[PDB]
Structures are given as structure tokens and as C-alpha cells.
Design a protein around this ligand. Structure first.
Ligand SMILES: NC(=O)c1ccc[n+]([C@@H]2O[C@H](COP(=O)([O-])OP(=O)([O-])OC[C@H]3O[C@@H](n4cnc5c(N)[nH+]cnc54)[C@H](O)[C@@H]3O)[C@@H](O)[C@H]2O)c1
Ligand SMILES: NC(=O)c1ccc[n+]([C@@H]2O[C@H](COP(=O)([O-])OP(=O)([O-])OC[C@H]3O[C@@H](n4cnc5c(N)[nH+]cnc54)[C@H](O)[C@@H]3O)[C@@H](O)[C@H]2O)c1
Ligand SMILES: NC(=O)c1ccc[n+]([C@@H]2O[C@H](COP(=O)([O-])OP(=O)([O-])OC[C@H]3O[C@@H](n4cnc5c(N)[nH+]cnc54)[C@H](O)[C@@H]3O)[C@@H](O)[C@H]2O)c1
Ligand SMILES: NC(=O)c1ccc[n+]([C@@H]2O[C@H](COP(=O)([O-])OP(=O)([O-])OC[C@H]3O[C@@H](n4cnc5c(N)[nH+]cnc54)[C@H](O)[C@@H]3O)[C@@H](O)[C@H]2O)c1
Ligand SMILES: CCCCCCCC(=O)O
Ligand SMILES: CCCCCCCC(=O)O
Ligand SMILES: CCCCCCCC(=O)O
Ligand SMILES: CCCCCCCC(=O)O
Ligand SMILES: [Zn+2]
Ligand SMILES: [Zn+2]
Ligand SMILES: [Zn+2]
Ligand SMILES: [Zn+2]
Ligand SMILES: [Zn+2]
Ligand SMILES: [Zn+2]
Ligand SMILES: [Zn+2]
Ligand SMILES: [Zn+2]
Ligand SMILES: [Zn+2]
Ligand SMILES: [Zn+2]
Lengths: 343, 343, 344, 344
């Protein structure tokens, strides 16, 4: 069984696929325990990545994966059948210069299960041993599934929060915009990784309440003049860092206007077009900084935090065959935190 | 005598003004030796700063100034009549937190001679002692005048090149876009301050030749598909840093498309609106970073470089009463390097 | 006009009358002292450790960790009036030299330092510069003000040092904080607030190890008992990513470099001991030894913010000014839990 | 199958036959050596300085600064075939541990180092990992290839150290580069290419001071003659922003910390001597002492780029392999101008 995109703007088809083949850079087959559903999956179905990615249809979605080793190629070391694992979403060579510098997402021969090739919305998936991080041998299936969103939502929030932390200090304000699958993790990470005052923005009451439970110092309903609210909270100074974990035209429109002098907007969500006068860029000396997933070391560090119990994903557990219900709900803002699908 | 903006989109009026008053934060009067003409002066006349600055008309323009001390308030130390000086363009308190951190342009009570108040297109100007940098006692009037553009064009290029250098390395490419008053200085500074391969872009043949004389490794005529040219020079990888020292809609349109993976666009020129899809911001993991003039330490470091003979401004010397001819020429692209006006 | 003054090295301070401070020049603020912290540097001062380097005129009043209330101000001083509660940055600087223009108060060319080389805060009143003043909330209680006194030197020093540490700490990294003293017990709290590192605190007194436990250390180690071996066991032989010496004795300067793992960094804050380490080990582990000196004005402001947020709190032992010599004796013996603060 | 091998410490290397290297496991490349640089570390090795730390099996072939031509490769190795000119990073690493995944080759858990602890390049052939190989332009002349040999250890070490230096250098800052040796003469060039600092070069031989002058040093200083006082005069008593010890003797380790100005940084590259400096000076000047260890693969690639651009060039003294012991004698005596490189 697998959930596959045959056509854009249609439901995924839940159907039988062949067992994955060990081949080429794919030397590990994982039995999926939990597969996170990302807003990127909505964008994928919508066709947003067609131009840039040009993938062969059909293919199985799912790029946020935990599971157990099923089978490995001869020569793969340190991995036996049954070993619990989390998967970095990039499959990379380790040979090009970016890889030699540790930047997995900038590797010249990158493949990405669930984005441009078959992913984890399936009973089994192939990946590379270089993408595997081993989890404690005794981890419970329940705890393992709970960690699935660390593989994409969490690692992306973590790298972005690392960026943020560089200019945050006590008394600094950070606006975290969008308390969603990524953003609710970022609220937690901002509190663990910086001493900054955290202002969380969203447009559903239950998500604002989730942000408070997770440590946000202030919450702002962005349906009601978010710039004015944030300017009030910051005594007209604006925020030192804003982080857009939504990426809609709406948020990309207003988030640059949250920034104070030498303010930085970390752009994580996508879909909208950035439009901002350069005279403001220079007169405020602000920056707009993309952040992309994260690297292997960053996933290892985030897994450590989770194992220490310092970050915990809010997870809504569903079955693989419920994927279309879950995607519909995610489009409508009806998923609190992160949905994760299980076989 | 002084050149003053009475009305927007009109020539400046060359007329008699009163001698400046020592008052408030203005405890130094300088006899102007050289006053640089900046493209910002065109933007000022056009009204671009009216909304953000709301200054009282008329006022004298000119924010790129060198001269000799004429008079100082009692209590001003280390400054006598006749001392040659260069002026940092910001007049600041030194008391707010930004100032205590060394960031003059982020000072909460900033004034800026020639931008929002009377400047240096005049025989005399008032400023603060905190804005003064003393030059060698024996400097010739000729050499002093040659240094005038360091006070704004140069310090702005220098801070921006400091930003650039942070991710440049041997084999890295930097595109420097606009070999103008600021940009021709930036070509020199890129070669002194980084080991990067410098690609200079402009749209007048003589400016491309100036860039070659100043050390550009490659030059590109941006009237002929600059993105394609730069992609060819960089074997489809793009540039590690692009620097926009033009700020027109034209350049803001194309400069983000010069960037390679983890590429950074340093935005210096202004006037255009930045418009770029977030899906590209994240998929390339690029950033867009404003740079604003520079701080007092940065001006001191740049003055050192000039005194070492490691940067030299290309200067077109004119009389104060020729200001309107010079502004017309600057609008039309007829000034090689930087015009400087003398009494 | 009572003050505690150093007249001779290796003798008790003299508690005596002195004239009221002169409001003049760069000394454009006089403060009525509310709380004056006692630092291990004060023992070093009395021992004569700073004579060679600072060559101060004797006698002078000690005390460089000060909070109080404005008494009066000179012309041109803005936003300060009699009664305003304040905490003082220990450096008195010009604001004109290049260091000052870059924001590094401790590297100002014309630096004077109340309590170190000129009269300080172990007195009813003390002169300083408005540039050294940070205003506290007008409503603060005297008790809370006094409890903040150690932030002015112990706290700011620990905070700058922890900022240095944080630059290479990450989840799963270990930091050894050595010396849970006046500075060190603050550093334990700051390492938890400012980094995600696993915190191992070392000391030689049981009550200081318990203090570190209450303040959030993940592990504590009694350094009378083979500290390097204990730290190597805790880190599975990898050593620590950052060690921080908040003691500075020969004993600690000798063992702390050996706590470091590969690319490890020793932040040296305490002083008195001589660093001695083979360069072959410096390069083969690629380690660094980095001094840290008090901190700058912005750093004191950030730290005051953390304190007002309730995220850092100093363990204080309050005594009267005229108990100064008894307190210095206790401090030399390791009998002050946290920081002693003197009040009028 | 000729090689220069260490059998006993404090004796000449033995020039003898050895079997051709075994292509196996992580050793998936064999190179025909074209040029093998001789490092001061080779004198330290023969002296037994590394025995304690590395505990290598004797005998083994020295030489860790190598260029050559691919001879053969094992399965799975891409983009390399017999005859390709190459320069070798001196570390042989797995690419799997966390250090490797972060790009720090020198901190890889399973690190092996040809010439230091296993057989090296003072031989006709040497085994290594494809991960250590950087391909040079196919057209390069043998003469130019050999001249690049020192970039593999002397150059990369100077380059990483200069990267560290550059982080706090600015126009008007001074850098003292101490030891215009095999590493140091490269560092002089790199300081000019990579920073805007004023470069003061120190050595104890006239010909090395002239070399530094030709390579662009702004000032040179004969360190037999009160180097600290001469540097203090050059800097108007401020000292240097960065000092770089490319000697590592007790003599230099003793004086180089005293070159530092406020917030100054000593980059320790040379080794052999013991660092000994008062902590009161470490904190009162807020100085740091920072080791630097060879460099990573990306850094070797950047340095090779600078060399191919003509922006750095090594001063080489070319000798035959079987002159190794005469060359080591000259090096111990300070009689090698630049870097000695051995050829077949
Ligand atoms: N850059 C990357 O590496 C990366 C990786 C993964 C996901 N993404 C993108 O990141 C974004 C977030 O993904 P996700 O967390 O799965 O989505 P999500 O779980 O659907 O969360 C989006 C959140 O935004 C909230 N929201 C909607 N409109 C507004 C508004 N106007 N103001 C404030 N909040 C609003 C919404 O209620 C929800 O909580 C999407 O654009 C993803 O495609 C980026
Ligand atoms: N951010 C700051 O602190 C700051 C300070 C000073 C000036 N400015 C701005 O910086 C910009 C440059 O000022 P300046 O150097 O005085 O102006 P300038 O001397 O008029 O130079 C502009 C240069 O851009 C070239 N140019 C025009 N169009 C293009 C094009 N399409 N592609 C490539 N090159 C082109 C032009 O030929 C000229 O050499 C202006 O927008 C100024 O207002 C910014
Ligand atoms: N660099 C600076 O800016 C700066 C500023 C202030 C103070 N200092 C110095 O910093 C050091 C700490 O000052 P303080 O906090 O006032 O001193 P303190 O309060 O006396 O604390 C010293 C602590 O070290 C503990 N200790 C003693 N020996 C050992 C040992 N072998 N191993 C582990 N712990 C031990 C001791 O029990 C006590 O808790 C002193 O050297 C001060 O002079 C430095
Ligand atoms: N950290 C590392 O990764 C690394 C790597 C390679 C070599 N090394 C070491 O770095 C040092 C330099 O190696 P090398 O360049 O091969 O040595 P070298 O070529 O023998 O150069 C040493 C230089 O120091 C000069 N010198 C000697 N005494 C003094 C003095 N008192 N003051 C100033 N100059 C003096 C000497 O004349 C010569 O020019 C040695 O200790 C090597 O073992 C370190
Ligand atoms: C926030 C102040 C903006 C200053 C504009 C400076 C432009 C120039 O110097 O040409
Ligand atoms: C350059 C590759 C782009 C990767 C897109 C990742 C989005 C996600 O993980 O949701
Ligand atoms: C633990 C690794 C030590 C490597 C020492 C390198 C010295 C040299 O390259 O000359
Ligand atoms: C050269 C300045 C030295 C200042 C030493 C500060 C020690 C302390 O604050 O306890
Ligand atoms: Zn995703
Ligand atoms: Zn790669
Ligand atoms: Zn549910
Ligand atoms: Zn200007
Ligand atoms: Zn200010
Ligand atoms: Zn002319
Ligand atoms: Zn103290
Ligand atoms: Zn100063
Ligand atoms: Zn070597
Ligand atoms: Zn490794």
C-alpha cells in the first residue's frame, strides 16, 4: 500500500505498489512506522513544484519519516532489521563541496523522497544509509511515531531558530508567524535556544492557545491588524527577528513590516511573492533570509533535544488510508500541530 | 553661499544663507573644502524621502563632506581652527543603546546634514564633534578634496563589502552591480578585502572600463541579459554574493536571479521594489540584506585604507555653483565615479 | 562619609571617615550606595596582586559591585535625579576613544574603575559617570535592589563569559562550569537560560554543589576528587566542548585545560594562577584558551533585563559595611554561599 | 618500492625497499608520488615527540605533504584514473562520523594520517582515500605540480590559521607572523591576500627576513634582538591585534603572548614548547590563545584555488628522496629557505 500523486489538484490514490528495490544510492529499505503530513504536500498536489522539480508521475508522497530498518545492501554497516530510525529527508552523495562542508540541502546530486521521488506514505520506502539516524534500541512504537515530524517540520524549525538566535538577546522580541506543524515546534525551540520574548501569530483561536501552552509570551490574532498589535507590544520598535512559518501572500505581505531596525525576517513558509520597497530595506537596514530544511548534524542535535524531553511535537495520529481526509483538513486549518500517518 | 531645495523636481537655488549657528548638538562649524554629490541627492529632489523624513523647506543639501574646522563650542576638545577633517554624515547622541553598541546609523535621535537638515553644499556647515574625524595635519587641499566621497559613498561601500566578505572565499564570485559613485569604490574594496572573483555590471562602456582599471576580473554589460552572462561566467552556479549599488527597478528585478545556492544579495541602492517568489527564496536558501551607510569605526577604518593608498576615489571636481549641471549629468549617467563640489 | 579603605597590602581594610565625593569632570554622578558586593578580586586587591598592573594611589576605598540611589548630578546629565534607583557598570569611560565608539567599555583608553584603582562603593556615597549608570524601575524595593548588586560585576562577568561559551554549544554539548562561587553560581543559571548544553558544575564544598543542583546543573562534581577523571567518565571520554574557570587558582588553571575535548574552549575568568599547557596538546586537540573581562554596557543592560524577568537570581549573604573584614575572611575560607553584599 | 622509514627515534631514517601498498578498505587510491614536502613535524617525529600521543607501529614511512599522479583505484572510486595529477589532504577519514558530516576532517573519529602514524609519501607509491584527493588541472607540468606539494600541509595549515586571524583584523590592525619558515612564508603571502592588516614578520635569520620583505611584509623584525620591544615600538605601545606562532619553540611560546594588545589573539600553530602565561594578564588584556590544526578539505580546495590563480606561491628547495637525512639536518639548523620538497 501507498498514497500516490497521479494527477495534480486531485486526491491522492491509495493503492498497491511494488516493494522498493535496492538500487544505486538506495541501499536501505525502511518499514515505515510514522509518516508526517506537511503543508508542502498540499503545495505538491497543487503543482507548485512542477516547474522546478519536473518529477515522473505517479510517485508516492511523504518526506517526514520514521520507521524500522527492513533490509540493507551488503556493505551497509551498523544497521540491522528492526532498528528504529529517523530519516533525514535528503538523499545525498557526500562527495560534492557542499556535502564536504556539511550542508546536505546544497548537495549537487540531491534527491528527496516524497518530493521528486517515492516517499513514506507507504508500508516501505527506500533511502540511503547516509540519511539514517539510529534511535535508542528500546524506543516504544508510540514514542517513535511521535518523533516523525522532527524529520522535516522540526529540523526546518531548528535550522531557522539557529538563524534567529544569532541576533536575539534578553529583551529582544521574536515574532513567530504561523503556529502550525513547523511553527508550534519553533515556539518551543525559541524558548529552549534563545532568551528572546516570543510573540506568536496565528488566525485560529486554538492555535493561539497551543502557542501559549508551549511558552509564547504573547499571542496575536493576525486577522486583526497584526502589524499594529506587534508595534504596540514592542512600544513602536518592532521585532528583532520575525519568522514566517506560513508563506502565504497574506503573511509575506505583512511580516516585513513587523521588523525593527536591523531586523531580520527568516522566511520558511513559501507560496507568496516577497514585495517590499528597497528604500525601507536600506533605511531600516533589514534582511530577508531563506531557510531550507536543515543538515544532518542539525537533525542529530534536534533528536537529542527531543530525547532530553525539551521539545515535543503535538501530533494527530491517523491511518495511511485517511490521507485525503488529513490533507483536506490541513488545507482548512483543521489540524492542531502535525498529522502523522501510521500503517 | 549655499545650494538649497525649496521645491521638489526643481533645480536647487544657489543663494546667500546666514552663517551657521552653534546650538544644541551642533558644536562644530566646518569650512567646507569638498562636498560630494550623491545619487541620493537626485532622489531627494524627486521627493523620495518626503514621506519618511518630512523635513522643513528650504534646506541646504550635501551629506558627503570634508573641510577645515572653522569654530567649535567651548568644551569641544582636540579641534582648532584650520584642522582638516572628514565628517561622518550622522549626527548622534552616543547615549542610546545602538550608540552604546557602536551603530551610529541606528541611533534613536539621529540627524543627518543634507538629508533632513542643512548640509555641505555651502561655504560652512554645522555638525557635532562626535561626527568629526581628524585627518593628517599636513594633508594638501587637493588630497583632502579627493577624500570627500569616503564620507558617504565610501563608508557605504565599505560596510557593504564587510557584509559580503563574511561568505566570500577563493573561487567565490561576487557581482558588483553599478560601477557608480559607490560601486567604483566597492570594486576596489572587494579586491583589498576579499579573495573573491569580481564581476562588475554596468550599462555604459566607460564605466565597464573604469571597473577593469580598478581590478574587476570580469565586466558585464547589463543591457544584454545580465543573468545569462553571469550564469555563463559562473558555469551555471551563480554568484555567492551580489551587491546592488544602483537600486533601480531594473536592477532590483534581475539581481536576485544572479544568486547561487546560499547566495546573498546586499541591497545598497534604493528606489525599486523587491519582488521575488518565496519558493525560490527557500529552495535556493538565499538572503536579501540591506546595508545602510556605516558606523564611526567603519569610517575610521576606511580613512586608514585611503591613507595607505589602497583605495582611491575617481573624482570629477566642479564648483558649488555648477551643482545643477552636475545633478543633471548624474541623472543621465554622465559622471565618471564621483562628482565633488568645491567653494 | 564612612568608608572601607586600603592603606596597606596584607592588612585589614580601615573603616574610617573620608570627605564626600567631588562632583567634577567625568565624575558627573554621585550615588548613595544601597548595596556593595564583595568580590574575590577584593581579596586579590588586599593581597597586592594588582599593585604592579594598576599602581593606584593609597589609600583608596574598595568596592566595584554597586547599586544605589542617585544623590546628585552635574550639568548636562539627562534622565537622572535624586532618589532614582540605579545599578553601576564598574568602568568609568570617556565614550570618545575608538573602543568606546565600538561599544567595548572594558577596552576604553582612559578607563578608571571605582574600587580597583580609585575610590569605590564600600562607602556611603560614590562618584561615577552617567555613562556607567543603568536606571532600574522606580518602584523597586530596597531589598530587591540590594539583591541585584552582584549583577554589576559578578553577573556581568558571568554573562559575557557565557555569551562566549554559547557560540559553540549545541544540544548534547557539555559545558563544565568550574567554581560555583559568586560569579559561578550565576553562570550555572545563565548556561541554562542561554544555551541548550548539558551543564557539569565543579566545586570543592558540598553546600556549593547542592547550590549548583538547585540552580539547574545536570551533574555536579567534587573537584577534590580527580575532577578530570570524573568529567571524562561523564562525557564518555570525549571531554567538554567548553570549560569555564570561575576560580582562577593554580589548582584550577592546572586541571581545567585537561577537561577539554576536540575543538574545546576554556574560558578563563578567574585569575591568580599561571596557565601552563603543552603546545603539542593545544594543536593536536585544536583547543583554545580565551580570557573574558567583566563586560560591556549593553551586556549589563541585557543581564539586568534577565534579572527583571526573574530568569536569574543571585544568592546573597547580606552584611553591614562595617563587617567587611569578617566577610573577606569568610570569603578567603570558602564560607560564603553565593555573594556577600554590604549595606549601610 | 624505495621508502624513507623511521625504525628508531633519534637516528637517521632508513632508505630501504618496502612492498607496494595494499589497495584495500578505506585505502582505495594509490598515488605515484611526484613531490613530498619535508616538514618541521618530521624532525619532531624522528625526535619521538609524537610517540606518546599516536603510539605508531615501527617501522613506518614518513611524509605527509604529498602530490603525485593516480596509479590505481579500487571499486566505486569516481573521477580518478591512472595519470591524473593530484594533491593529497593529509588526513584519511571515513566521512561517516559527526565531525566528518560537519566538514572538519581533522576531527574525524577514525582519523589516520599518512606519514604521522602510518606509511606516508617519502616513497615511490602511497595509499590513501579518495576522500583525501583533490584533482589538479590535467595539463599541469611536473615542475608546477611539485611546487604545489607544500600546499598539502604547510599551506593548508597556514591558510586555516590565517582564516582564524582574519576574523578580527581590519585596516590599521597589526598582525605579527612569527617564523618565516615553510608554513610562515606562506602565511605572509596569505595575510596580504586575505586581510587588510599591517604585517610584521619575525625571524632570526637574515635571508628569512629578506624573504618576508619580498613576499610583502610591511615590517620585519629580527627576533634575536628583543622582539617584544621592537614590536611595541612599531605599534606605538599598543601591541598586535593577532600574533601567529609558526615556530612553536620554547623561545617563541614565551615571547609571543607578550606581543598581544587588548583583545589580542595568539594563533598557536608551531608546537614543542609549553605555554606559560599569568591568568591575570589573560583577563586584564582579554586575550586568547587559539590552536590551529592543519585544515579541512574545503580549506585545501580554497587554497589550491588561490595557488592556481597565482596569488600564493611556495618557495621550494628541491632534492632527491635519498637526500632526506641531509635535508632534515639542514632544516634543524635553519638552513632551508622556504620548504624542501623531495622528488623521485
Ligand atoms: N523552507 C522549508 O524548508 C520548509 C520545509 C517544510 C515546510 N515548508 C513550508 O512551511 C509552511 C508551513 O508548513 P506547515 O507548518 O506544514 O503548515 P501548517 O501546519 O498548515 O501551518 C500553517 C499555519 O499558519 C497559520 N496561518 C494561516 N494564515 C495565517 C496568517 N495570515 N497569519 C498567521 N498565521 C496564519 C495556520 O493557521 C497554521 O497554523 C508551508 O508553506 C510549507 O510548505 C517549508
Ligand atoms: N544604502 C545606503 O546607505 C546608500 C548611501 C548612499 C547612496 N545610496 C544609493 O545607492 C545607489 C548608488 O548611488 P551612487 O553611486 O551615488 O549612484 P551613481 O553614481 O548614479 O551610480 C549608479 C550606477 O549604476 C549604473 N547603472 C544604471 N542602471 C544600471 C543597470 N540596469 N545595471 C547596472 N548598472 C546600472 C550607472 O550607469 C551608474 O554607474 C543610489 O540608489 C543611491 O541613492 C545608498
Ligand atoms: N575576569 C574578570 O572580569 C573577573 C571579574 C570578577 C572576578 N574575577 C575573578 O573570578 C574568580 C571568582 O571570583 P568570585 O566568584 O568572586 O570568587 P568566590 O565567590 O570566592 O568563588 C570561588 C569558588 O571556587 C570554588 N573553588 C575553589 N577551589 C576550587 C577547585 N579546586 N575546583 C573547583 N572549585 C573550586 C570555591 O569553593 C568557590 O565556590 C576570582 O579569581 C575573581 O578574582 C574575574
Ligand atoms: N598545527 C599544525 O597543524 C602544524 C602543521 C605543520 C607544522 N606544524 C609546526 O609548525 C612549526 C613550523 O613548521 P615549519 O614551517 O615546517 O618549520 P620551519 O620551516 O623549520 O620554520 C621555522 C621558522 O622559525 C624561525 N625561527 C626559529 N626560532 C625563531 C624565533 N625565536 N623567533 C622567530 N622565528 C624563529 C626559523 O628560522 C624558521 O624560518 C613547527 O613546530 C611544525 O612542527 C604545525
Ligand atoms: C535611516 C536614515 C537613512 C539615511 C539615508 C542615507 C542615504 C545616503 O547617505 O545617501
Ligand atoms: C532544493 C530542495 C527543496 C526542498 C523542499 C523541501 C520542502 C519541505 O521539506 O517541506
Ligand atoms: C591528532 C592529529 C595531529 C596531526 C598533527 C599534524 C602536524 C603536521 O601536519 O605537520
Ligand atoms: C585592566 C582592567 C582590569 C579589571 C579587572 C576586573 C576584576 C573584577 O571586576 O573583579
Ligand atoms: Zn515538508
Ligand atoms: Zn553532495
Ligand atoms: Zn485526529
Ligand atoms: Zn548619499
Ligand atoms: Zn544614539
Ligand atoms: Zn568635470
Ligand atoms: Zn570583581
Ligand atoms: Zn573610551
Ligand atoms: Zn607537517
Ligand atoms: Zn569521520
Amino acid at each position: 500500500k501507498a498514497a500516490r500523486l497521479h494527477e495534480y489538484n486531485k486526491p491522492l490514490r491509495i493503492e498497491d505498489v511494488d516493494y522498493p528495490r535496492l538500487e544505486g544510492r538506495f541501499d536501505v529499505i525502511v518499514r515505515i512506522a510514522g509518516a508526517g503530513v506537511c503543508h508542502t504536500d498540499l503545495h505538491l498536489v497543487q503543482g507548485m513544484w512542477h516547474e522546478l522539480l519536473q518529477p515522473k508521475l505517479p510517485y508516492t508522497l511523504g518526506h517526514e519519516n520514521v520507521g524500522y530498518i527492513e533490509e540493507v545492501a551488503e556493505g551497509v554497516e551498523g544497521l540491522e532489521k528492526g532498528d528504529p530510525v529517523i530519516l533525514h529527508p535528503a538523499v545525498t552523495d557526500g562527495t560534492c563541496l557542499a556535502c564536504r562542508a556539511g550542508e546536505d540541502m546544497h548537495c549537487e546530486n540531491l534527491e528527496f523522497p516524497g518530493l521528486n521521488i517515492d516517499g513514506g506514505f507507504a508500508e516501505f520506502m527506500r533511502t540511503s544509509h547516509r540519511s539514517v539516524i539510529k534511535l535508542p534500541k528500546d524506543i516504544s512504537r508510540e514514542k517513535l511515531v511521535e518523533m516523525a515530524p522532527l524529520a522535516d517540520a522540526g529540523i526546518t524549525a531548528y535550522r531557522a531558530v539557529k538563524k534567529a538566535a544569532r541576533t536575539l538577546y534578553p529583551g529582544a522580541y521574536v515574532a513567530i508567524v504561523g503556529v502550525g506543524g513547523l511553527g508550534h515546534i519553533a515556539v518551543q525551540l525559541l524558548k529552549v535556544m534563545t532568551p528572546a520574548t516570543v510573540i506568536a501569530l496565528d488566525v485560529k483561536e486554538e492555535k493561539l492557545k497551543l502557542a501559549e501552552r508551549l511558552g509564547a509570551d504573547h499571542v496575536v490574532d493576525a486577522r486583526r491588524d497584526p502589524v499594529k498589535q506587534v508595534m504596540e507590544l514592542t512600544r513602536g520598535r518592532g521585532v528583532n527577528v520575525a519568522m514566517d512559518f506560513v508563506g502565504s501572500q497574506a503573511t509575506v505581505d505583512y511580516t516585513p513590516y513587523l521588523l525593527g531596525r536591523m531586523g531580520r525576517l527568516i522566511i520558511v513558509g513559501y507560496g507568496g511573492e516577497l514585495r517590499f520597497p528597497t528604500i525601507r530595506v536600506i533605511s531600516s537596514e533589514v534582511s530577508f533570509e531563506g531557510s531550507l530544511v536543515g543538515n544532518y548534524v542539525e537533525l542529530h542535535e534536534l533528536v537529542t533535544l527531543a530525547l532530553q524531553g525539551k521539545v515535543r511535537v503535538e501530533v494527530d495520529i491517523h491511518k495511511l488510508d485517511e490521507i485525503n481526509d488529513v490533507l483536506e483538513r490541513l488545507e482548512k486549518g483543521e489540524v492542531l500541530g502535525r498529522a502523522v500517518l501510521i500503517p
